[PDB]
Amino acid sequence: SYYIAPRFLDKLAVHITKNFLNIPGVRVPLILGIHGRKGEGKTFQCELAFEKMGIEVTLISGGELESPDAGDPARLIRLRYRETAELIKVRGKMCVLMINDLDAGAGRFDEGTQYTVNTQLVNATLMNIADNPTDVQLPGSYDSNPIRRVPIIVTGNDFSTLYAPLIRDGRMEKFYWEPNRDDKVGIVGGIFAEDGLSQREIEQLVDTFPKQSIDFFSALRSRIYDIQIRDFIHKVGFERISLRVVNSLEAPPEFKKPDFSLAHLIESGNLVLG
Amino acid sequence: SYYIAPRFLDKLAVHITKNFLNIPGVRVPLILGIHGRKGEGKTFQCELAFEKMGIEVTLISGGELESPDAGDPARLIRLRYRETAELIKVRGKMCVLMINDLDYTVNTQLVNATLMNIADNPTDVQLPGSYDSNPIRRVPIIVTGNDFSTLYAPLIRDGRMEKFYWEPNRDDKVGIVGGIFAEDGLSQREIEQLVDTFPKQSIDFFSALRSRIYDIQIRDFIHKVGFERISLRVVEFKKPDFSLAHLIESGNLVLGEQQ
Amino acid sequence: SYYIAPRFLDKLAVHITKNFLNIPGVRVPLILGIHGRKGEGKTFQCELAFEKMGIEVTLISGGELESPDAGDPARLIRLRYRETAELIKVRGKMCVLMINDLDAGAGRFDEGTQYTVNTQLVNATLMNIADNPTDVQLPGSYDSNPIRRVPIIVTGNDFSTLYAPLIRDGRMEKFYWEPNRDDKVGIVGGIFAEDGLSQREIEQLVDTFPKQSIDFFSALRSRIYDIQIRDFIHKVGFERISLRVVNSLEAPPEFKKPDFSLAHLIESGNLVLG
Amino acid sequence: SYYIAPRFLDKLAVHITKNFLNIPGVRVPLILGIHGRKGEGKTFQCELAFEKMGIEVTLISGGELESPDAGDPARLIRLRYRETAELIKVRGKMCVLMINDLDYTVNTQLVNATLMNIADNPTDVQLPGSYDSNPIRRVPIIVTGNDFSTLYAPLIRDGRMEKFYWEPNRDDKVGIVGGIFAEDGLSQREIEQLVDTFPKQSIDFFSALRSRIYDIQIRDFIHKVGFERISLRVVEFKKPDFSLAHLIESGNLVLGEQQ
Amino acid sequence: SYYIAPRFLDKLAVHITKNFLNIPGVRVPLILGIHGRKGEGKTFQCELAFEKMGIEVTLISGGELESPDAGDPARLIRLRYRETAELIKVRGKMCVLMINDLDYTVNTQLVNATLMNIADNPTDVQLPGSYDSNPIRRVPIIVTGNDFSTLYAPLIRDGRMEKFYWEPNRDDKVGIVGGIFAEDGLSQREIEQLVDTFPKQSIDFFSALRSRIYDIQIRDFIHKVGFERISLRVVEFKKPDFSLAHLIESGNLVLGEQQ
Amino acid sequence: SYYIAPRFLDKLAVHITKNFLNIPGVRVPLILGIHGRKGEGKTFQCELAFEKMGIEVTLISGGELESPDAGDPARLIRLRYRETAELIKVRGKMCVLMINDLDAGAGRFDEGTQYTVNTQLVNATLMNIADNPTDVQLPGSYDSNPIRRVPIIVTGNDFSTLYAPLIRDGRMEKFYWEPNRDDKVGIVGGIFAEDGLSQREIEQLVDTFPKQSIDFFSALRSRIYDIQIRDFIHKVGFERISLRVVNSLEAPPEFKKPDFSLAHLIESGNLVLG
């Protein structure tokens, strides 16, 4: 039911596969930096691609690299790297290290706290790894055998100028994700795939809200269930609704998919934006 | 008995319940932003609904997030969120986080930023500097304010926050005002007349009008006894007029000298 | 000679008296918050009312709550509360606790120092007291008998949103003080009461400077004595003026009240504003 | 002997004395703000009057409050205020606090804020963080500056501060300039001519003009001896021309190359 | 073999050498500000010239000065300057300090301020808080950025900094692009055609175009094998088309979906 | 070849000489404060004057007074003062103490570091010295004989209001240096003195760039040598240019003075400003 943008799947599949091939004549970047604004399915499209290709993923949260409880982020990144490399030797399949939301509380998400991702240390680490993907030792350790090369995917809203040297030496490649009209028709099409909307109506929906994100359209669909939810609360009664939903004694409530029109969707859309 | 406006009760109940229902292929907004004129019962009716539904609420005051004496509003929000998340696991009931009178400019950005981050991942809400692999329960957030900053537009567009404008209509006033004077022996028509006499006023005006009727009796009692000997006299026992005529008389005197 | 605004006296007298009556059917707020801008006689009108009604007042300065030398402000507020309550039992008269300038160095009065009133602790304390005015123990003390309810008056330029819960539960009532035209005619009338100005001229004076504070008008009157003061300095001579005034050997200089017109007052007023 | 302008002496003396007189039913401004063009003798004449009246003055420089090296200007003002307040009790004489050249933007607000707070309660002036039940003596404050910020308008409206614009007229110049050249053997008409020759200049120009007459002699002495051997010669003894013609000659050369 | 544009090599070599020549009666700018569109080879050609001239370079990244994680950019610049100054004394060769991608706003002022101060006295460059009577060697500084703030105008006016706008012309592209595809068996006319096909693009586009030719082969190999079984297959061996037709085909597909 | 502005030389020579004469009837300022913007030859004109008059100079850098490594700046200033005074008694010639760039990293030169010149301590010191130039003891020392008066020259972009008391008591004199048209013709004339430009062309050059500093014009002249420098690099070859210039084995390269016109200078000027 979920639509994968072909060019998104291609970019990510080519990047990973290219890191498991040894093609001379060109340098392969170890790191793929996927940036773009929120609510466009950056991470979600990655997951669809990893599922599609059967790729196991070692994950590092940006809130993990932000926290002193992660100890030294340089140490954590290296550990997870060596962890992912072993899985390649063991599982005998493509494995990927992924660092999500590399700029956790930066910009319009800044909460003005003491703690922030040591981006310069993270950058420095990725630079050290990228220079020699086969020899990635923990700080202090020296006597260890060559290790498997692990492709790295990093996502964020944008990437610092600190990453320019990585890019300039082809150790990293930036991929800007902003869904175009063709992408939106595809993605929004998959969201309303079971709602009996034609190709044109889906195009009209996209064309009616050309500046909105993918999340705007899925949110548009979700609010239609509210009438059923209201009625369901009335039947159960306000006094007992809490027990009915949170206590998993009786079966969860079964809701029907509602019939709606492009007209209705557009009306709702304008109300949301209004 | 105090009156809850049906469409207010619905909107709030649907939002909370919708956050505890895990319908697949359906993404839910975590935040309900209730906005409108001050003193229209945004807070009071929220509390009526929580009582009605037996919902335990974790309440943060807006002034608690604005005052520099609070220090770190991001921390305070995240603490109260994780606390409420735990009460869901423990009590096995619907629980809610609520932020009141949200409408300083430095902190408004930080609060907005915090609610955005939480709404992006309601399950992964860590304290600043801390990290915990344990997923916590999703906690619906109810916010109250006069109007919400354009900083909240991204949340509303992406369906991470739902706005709900609260402006009580005539029926809503008749119900609410009727509950305010429920024990003052006023008929339906006398309640309808009172509302129709002050059609542009907030619910706050009417609850204030009731209190002033008592103040009037106390004022006249002081004038009779005199300011000179009022202290000795005390150191105003009968039920006040409360007629529809007396209330209208007081209301017009308040409108002549309001704020 | 000083004019008390009736509605100011009523509000304050009703608030206090209401706290010594036990009228059912309505909750009595313990706290009256009087706010409004400077130079309008907030505190001065309170004092006139307390004198009028023979009410003894326990005072807490905002600069007191700002100072660590006051120790714990929660502790100080409670002490003064219990102190005022005993006076009710002893004196057998109405007694009031009053906290002045609750926002000392906030806003346009901010001197950018480390020290400021812990408004959140003060608020928290008043909330604890207001919830149970009869049981107000010092932090740590527990075994103490019920105490007399003490009405509290707080003054400030404005009150934080922190006080909304107190207001919402009717534990506190806000009273905004901005003198209206009728109030000004009264107050300004009392200022120029012995200056042989008619009712109309006093109205004209108020109408000529409609945006000014009460302090503007009293200041207007005070500057007229300057000629007498000048001449008095000349007679005594600049060499000996310091001894004459500061050393209380001989009698203080006796000044006559000058004759002046509405015209003169308005001219002076425009010069001051100019 | 240096000349104090009578209306300047009056205005300043009346302000100070008025602050030590406790006339009932009469409220006094604590602050006198003397404003006007730079170098017109605002500071110099203040000092002449204090000497005349035997007033001990506590002086704070404007640069002392503007430089971030000062740290806390609010503290510094309050320290000097309480200090002056104590000298009144001890010496039993009129004492004054004076702030010079008040005309950075961060500190200007803090200074304004401090003077406002003090002027509101001249008797209750505590240091930040300190509290003392003891009332202290009221200390008149004299401020000097080119012009006062609109931040001071509330003070002036409420009669907590009096403004006094200082622009010396012809009579004032004749007196002041006459005192500058008092020991140079110039007649009244020669002083009047000098002022009338430079009618738009500040008092600062004239005291600077006198100093330049000496510099001219020294300049010519160096030209005669030569820059090559001037060091040996020294390591310019007679009274300079000082005629009304020579002063005018110098003045025009200064106006041709001023600032 | 990679191509350096002659006028780029000249301008940069003249600037460095001019800073090591002590011609009397001739003052030299310390800083060369190379500005122009992003990805036109400002950095890459600087490195080619340093290699050509055997110049050891001390390199600071622009992001190293912009990120608040750096802490003190003034310190970092001064440290690297004194370090380079010492390498001149030790190695007895031309050395250079270079700051890349200089085009946050708080730090831009601090960087500008630092470069101004250094350019005023290249011999007297102390660390903040430190002082050393020892004069150090003059170190030419090369800066790179899209455009330089008007904060740098004083430097350029006083001849403490020279601006050099870099926009590669056709000849420059033919040379540079020719070096990018030097080992791909393309003739001169095929290189000239490639440049003339994309006359408005940056050098970055062309080096990116070469890399995409390999990505295309890998993409088609994945489509053939299928996404389902690509992992097993691997856990794309031949020389790609690289014809002038294939490059143009790829380029147009990149222009249809760029940034 | 270098032009000294007469009025600059006069002001500085009169100030110094006046400090070695004991002329009654007027107070002599000990301190001359020379301020004005950068690139106008403030310090350079001072040096030309000191050379002209054979005056030895004790120097204090503003970066010296900024550094804790200078210890106590009050102590340093006093030491250098007493050091300069002894040279007067020994050398038997005019000697001067000079404090350069008294506002090192202030304003548009602020690098946002912890360290800045303690201007208030420096001011306080100069005030103490100026009050009694003959008795300048180090902090702690007391038993020392009278010392020679030393004139002080301070340069900066501007001087704080902290220096007003020094000025007001005639202990200090401000001298604003902004070269006028006559000064520029002189200074720029000396810069292009050997370039066969007429008086009018030099006036035209100045009039073409009326808002520019002296440094703008000298920079204008310097860039003309670039062609010779380019060619010289080509002859030696890029591979060996570093050895040729930095290694002082062979003689330094000999460059000829180029011929150029007013037209060429103006073209270059507009390009620089453009």
Ligand SMILES: Nc1ncnc2c1ncn2[C@@H]1O[C@H](COP(=O)(O)OP(=O)(O)O)[C@@H](O)[C@H]1O
């Ligand atoms: N539902 C109600 N029943 C009785 N009184 C009400 C009701 N709603 C509002 N009030 C009167 O006005 C108050 C002020 O309204 P509030 O809930 O604070 O509105 P807001 O939160 O919109 O400012 C309530 O505390 C009350 O005194």
Ligand SMILES: Nc1ncnc2c1ncn2[C@@H]1O[C@H](COP(=O)(O)OP(=O)(O)O)[C@@H](O)[C@H]1O
């Ligand atoms: N009354 C005076 N008698 C002699 N000289 C004066 C007099 N007033 C001003 N001056 C000459 O000009 C100075 C600069 O004036 P000042 O008092 O500083 O004015 P402002 O404080 O207005 O800048 C005085 O110090 C002095 O050198």
Ligand SMILES: Nc1ncnc2c1ncn2[C@@H]1O[C@H](COP(=O)(O)OP(=O)(O)O)[C@@H](O)[C@H]1O
């Ligand atoms: N001279 C060159 N030879 C080969 N490739 C070049 C050359 N110059 C630029 N490039 C291609 O584009 C890059 C991006 O250009 P860069 O030097 O970073 O420009 P800027 O510094 O102007 O952004 C170089 O690293 C390279 O991949």
Ligand SMILES: [Cl-]
């Ligand atoms: Cl590392």
Ligand SMILES: [Cl-]
């Ligand atoms: Cl849109």
Ligand SMILES: [Cl-]
């Ligand atoms: Cl109404």
Ligand SMILES: [Cl-]
């Ligand atoms: Cl408490």
Ligand SMILES: [Cl-]
């Ligand atoms: Cl007005």
Ligand SMILES: [Cl-]
């Ligand atoms: Cl004039």
Ligand SMILES: [Cl-]
């Ligand atoms: Cl093109």
Ligand SMILES: [Cl-]
């Ligand atoms: Cl000292």
Ligand SMILES: [Cl-]
């Ligand atoms: Cl110009």
